[PDB]
Amino acid sequence: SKVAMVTGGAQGIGRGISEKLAADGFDIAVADLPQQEEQAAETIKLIEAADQKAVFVGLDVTDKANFDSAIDEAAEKLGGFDVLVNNAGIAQIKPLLEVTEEDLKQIYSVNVFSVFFGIQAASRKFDELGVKGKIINAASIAAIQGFPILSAYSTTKFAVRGLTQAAAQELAPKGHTVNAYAPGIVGTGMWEQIDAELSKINGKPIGENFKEYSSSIALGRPSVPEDVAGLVSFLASENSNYVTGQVMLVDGGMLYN
Amino acid sequence: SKVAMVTGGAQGIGRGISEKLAADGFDIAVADLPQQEEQAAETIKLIEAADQKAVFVGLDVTDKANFDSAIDEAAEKLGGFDVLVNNAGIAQIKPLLEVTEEDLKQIYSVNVFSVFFGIQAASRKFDELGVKGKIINAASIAAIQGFPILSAYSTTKFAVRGLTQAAAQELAPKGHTVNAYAPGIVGTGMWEQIDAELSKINGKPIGENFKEYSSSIALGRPSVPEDVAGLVSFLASENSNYVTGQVMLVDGGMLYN
Amino acid sequence: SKVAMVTGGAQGIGRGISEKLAADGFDIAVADLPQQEEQAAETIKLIEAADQKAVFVGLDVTDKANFDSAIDEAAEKLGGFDVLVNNAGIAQIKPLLEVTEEDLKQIYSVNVFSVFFGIQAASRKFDELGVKGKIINAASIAAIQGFPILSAYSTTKFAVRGLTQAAAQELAPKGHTVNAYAPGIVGTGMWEQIDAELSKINGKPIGENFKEYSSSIALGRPSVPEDVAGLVSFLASENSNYVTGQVMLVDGGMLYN
Amino acid sequence: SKVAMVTGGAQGIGRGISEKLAADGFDIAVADLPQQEEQAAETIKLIEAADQKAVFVGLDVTDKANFDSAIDEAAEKLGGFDVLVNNAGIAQIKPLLEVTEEDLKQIYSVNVFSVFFGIQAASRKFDELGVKGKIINAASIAAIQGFPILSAYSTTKFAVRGLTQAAAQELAPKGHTVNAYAPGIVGTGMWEQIDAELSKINGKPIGENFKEYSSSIALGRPSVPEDVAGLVSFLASENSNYVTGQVMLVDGGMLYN
Ligand SMILES: NC(=O)c1ccc[n+]([C@@H]2O[C@H](COP(=O)([O-])OP(=O)(O)OC[C@H]3O[C@@H](n4cnc5c(N)ncnc54)[C@H](O)[C@@H]3O)[C@@H](O)[C@H]2O)c1
Ligand SMILES: NC(=O)c1ccc[n+]([C@@H]2O[C@H](COP(=O)([O-])OP(=O)(O)OC[C@H]3O[C@@H](n4cnc5c(N)ncnc54)[C@H](O)[C@@H]3O)[C@@H](O)[C@H]2O)c1
Ligand SMILES: NC(=O)c1ccc[n+]([C@@H]2O[C@H](COP(=O)([O-])OP(=O)(O)OC[C@H]3O[C@@H](n4cnc5c(N)ncnc54)[C@H](O)[C@@H]3O)[C@@H](O)[C@H]2O)c1
Ligand SMILES: NC(=O)c1ccc[n+]([C@@H]2O[C@H](COP(=O)([O-])OP(=O)(O)OC[C@H]3O[C@@H](n4cnc5c(N)ncnc54)[C@H](O)[C@@H]3O)[C@@H](O)[C@H]2O)c1
Ligand SMILES: [Mg+2]
Numbered sequence A, B, C, D: 001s002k003v004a005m006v007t008g009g010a011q012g013i014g015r016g017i018s019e020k021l022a023a024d025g026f027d028i029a030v031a032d033l034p035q036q037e038e039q040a041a042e043t044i045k046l047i048e049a050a051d052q053k054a055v056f057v058g059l060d061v062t063d064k065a066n067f068d069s070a071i072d073e074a075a076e077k078l079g080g081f082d083v084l085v086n087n088a089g090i091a092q093i094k095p096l097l098e099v100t101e102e103d104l105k106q107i108y109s110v111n112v113f114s115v116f117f118g119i120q121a122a123s124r125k126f127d128e129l130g131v132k133g134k135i136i137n138a139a140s141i142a143a144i145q146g147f148p149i150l151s152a153y154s155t156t157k158f159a160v161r162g163l164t165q166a167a168a169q170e171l172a173p174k175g176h177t178v179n180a181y182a183p184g185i186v187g188t189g190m191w192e193q194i195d196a197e198l199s200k201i202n203g204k205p206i207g208e209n210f211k212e213y214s215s216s217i218a219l220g221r222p223s224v225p226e227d228v229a230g231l232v233s234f235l236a237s238e239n240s241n242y243v244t245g246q247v248m249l250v251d252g253g254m255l256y257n
């Protein structure tokens, strides 16, 4: 089977992607923080229910060395490495005038620097194994339009968008492709947090902010990991071999770029 | 089963899309100009070889009435109608200052008005059958960045881009999605034509223009109908359900949007 | 004195642009439909009040020959021709499924073919006069994001967007630049018509659709011609000499591209 | 007289902007590294030659505390504060696979974090003075399309693009606007550096990389500070009052977005 690593695969969009890629015939390397291993258990169970090989790989994407060994371990255990999905990331909700250098340093490390490290490690591995790989990064609608109150987060996603473009161009001659998926409003822990932090600011009751930000989706429904998985499935398959440097929206109809 | 109509399916990108969707398990209605029914023989041959039902449908996409009946016929012959691919289209190569009103009327009818007609007929057929359909339009890199000497063509593709966004939002409540594919340099009959005409204009030898316009492709190789077929496969599949109003580039890396 | 022709200058944005460019030192050729001369009386008044020459020129931008004669007349009566603002245009409001071929031919003629003709005529005159000119087209937020119910209109603006790009690249070697302005919701006769047609569709009282569509403008206020004139002033000035092929948003904060 | 602070105004585009704004009627605060004071003496001369007041303010934009005191000092010395131009920035030239965390921390601090700091300090001063202000950020064509070998730098500019959008929406209620200028290839000390570094990488002789990258400019020639100052002049004037959250390209025709 082909091998793909999904960072942040312990839960949310990461888990959904892992389950889907497994159904597509990929053996999966579920990479996420070491403390998230128990949480990853379910993700692992889903991969194995799809009749594929799964292994958890402890990783803090903010650390290059850890990312390099994380990918070596994954390739070793699964006997290959063909796709890297840089899904791991965090969100920050805070008025622009309140953002601190501390906030910035932290979110750029987890959301941007990590992608540089994952791209570099994926590249080394691909070449080492003598194969053409696929790198898939998690952008967002916030990478296409900056969102108020989520300025720090938005800027890191824009950075990911720009990185996807530059990296795809530098790795293209080697035959590797780099694309990104941009989901809309996905009811995961990230939004329970966003909605919770928004509530503390505007006073709207819990869950209410989620509904308002969701009221604009053309298809009239908030998203679930499966929706995002569908696009990532394409980005990992052979059908996307001629697509590179793009950031594709899977937002049910929110932005049209 | 699932039924899809591919206009301009008698050759080039249209044929490849028909063959791809056939492999995906779609019964195909190859819609093209009556004059191309013979040229379309091979296409129907490629479809039946993938063990799917294929029927030719005489259609001049510029004629609304013909498009309405064309879809009625396809839905009656194949027993259903789930996907429409507005692929039929033409190219014009001419310096801006030389473009005539007749050039404009001609190209806008085939490249733009036709997509409106197709979108309307498809939407009505989806509703009659009680199906949530997928409409896929043929955009192009020229729909993202206007190209000199191909201004008329570029403008129609930009129109398709805008139409794709507008139609997606308008048809979302019925559950229908509208997306587009934007290929780069695809070595089909259309580019033989483009290279030939550009040759007469700038004087460069035959084939040289084709190479010239291809020297920017990150992946380092021009495109074939198969490359585009890959994206359309995703757009016609269930994996793209939460994607709408988007114009996705399959250009090997030329524009990044 | 520097000379600028403003098509559709009898009222709305065209009138605002005329008055502004006059204030900037331009003599203005107010080009509009013959029956609009009386209406243009105010535009001309506003222009002459800035110690500048103003002349009404009968022009139906949908006719190539008339555009040529109009620019010739403007150049001869004002003694030069430095800037052409392709502002004339119309709006159509109608569900996508109701859009007829007649509607399409009409709106594309007025909003798109007209711009080709305008660009061609302006380019000729510039060269004839041995000067480098500025062509400024009227785009719209609808050229950046298609709007439902105004699908035909949106597609024409996207076409204008593409035309601006293609033309800028094609005319650059001659030193001419082609840019466009993209206003948001401006209270003119065009929005009176849009609001009125929307009202017929959703039953909202007159003025409410305008208010609703304007409720999300970041700067918290609908637009007036003067706002747009601000950008066009830049685009007609020496300050924009190194800007070309761009579609610039002056929408108070609606779309960000 | 109105007051504007131009960071990195000791030379290059910053100097060009300071001179232009001075010419438009603004008193200028030239903010740059203390070591650049002597260098800035040239900028100060160009400003005073316009019969406008000028002062140098020692500022390392990466230091938030320093940025707050610099704006205080600026507003106090010039008796006002209406415009802030976040122009200070650096470039890095290095293959993606070689980018280090040290490079990233470095370039993001100077190119992105500083902008957050400037916006915050500007906003606070604007409100303190009870005025509506304009914030203008230095983006780049690299903020619109990521460039190979300039990945780190590109990603920072994309972040600035996102920041400009998010800040615009967040500060709009107060009446402040935030926009950005995106220069193309400007022959300043920065490109001297980029060319020199590119030279060591691809072996091309000195100066050839500058020409190579410039070859594609529609208007046929590289840019000078004044080309950029033209757009900034618009961005600092009342003509841009209804424009916000935009990143406008002044690249002579390289990217069209
Ligand atoms: N939820 C949404 O609506 C939405 C919209 C757009 C984009 N995204 C993006 O999709 C991705 C997944 O988001 P989600 O909703 O599933 O989030 P989530 O919080 O549910 O899951 C994120 C996972 O990332 C892991 N992680 C965090 N920091 C890490 C680090 N330093 N090293 C390794 N693993 C780390 C977490 O342990 C967690 O399992 C993110 O990049 C997010 O920005 C989400
Ligand atoms: N070839 C490329 O490099 C390229 C790049 C981008 C986009 N496209 C788009 O993809 C589509 C297919 O292009 P292609 O290369 O396969 O072209 P092609 O010339 O090989 O095929 C075009 C098909 O369109 C049919 N057709 C033309 N006018 C028609 C009409 N009025 N009614 C019905 N059928 C009609 C023709 O019979 C023909 O089979 C077009 O819309 C084109 O704009 C092509
Ligand atoms: N009103 C808005 O909110 C808005 C937003 C974006 C873009 N625009 C664009 O700005 C431009 C001006 O719009 P407006 O609000 O001032 O409209 P308007 O209806 O107030 O003015 C349009 C002018 O165009 C002239 N005109 C129409 N058809 C013509 C033809 N065939 N030949 C010559 N002149 C013709 C009319 O006589 C009229 O004076 C249009 O291109 C429009 O699409 C308007
Ligand atoms: N040169 C180009 O072609 C080009 C194209 C697009 C965008 N830009 C952008 O325009 C801006 C100006 O570039 P340039 O060509 O004038 O560069 P430059 O090197 O000529 O000038 C940059 C100035 O920034 C100052 N500076 C650097 N770090 C600083 C810090 N931490 N604190 C305070 N001041 C600091 C320097 O002292 C210097 O005077 C940058 O943001 C750059 O990214 C340049
Ligand atoms: Mg697929």
Ligand SMILES: [Mg+2]
Pocket: C233, C234, C237, C239, D233, D234, D237, D239
């Ligand atoms: Mg100006």
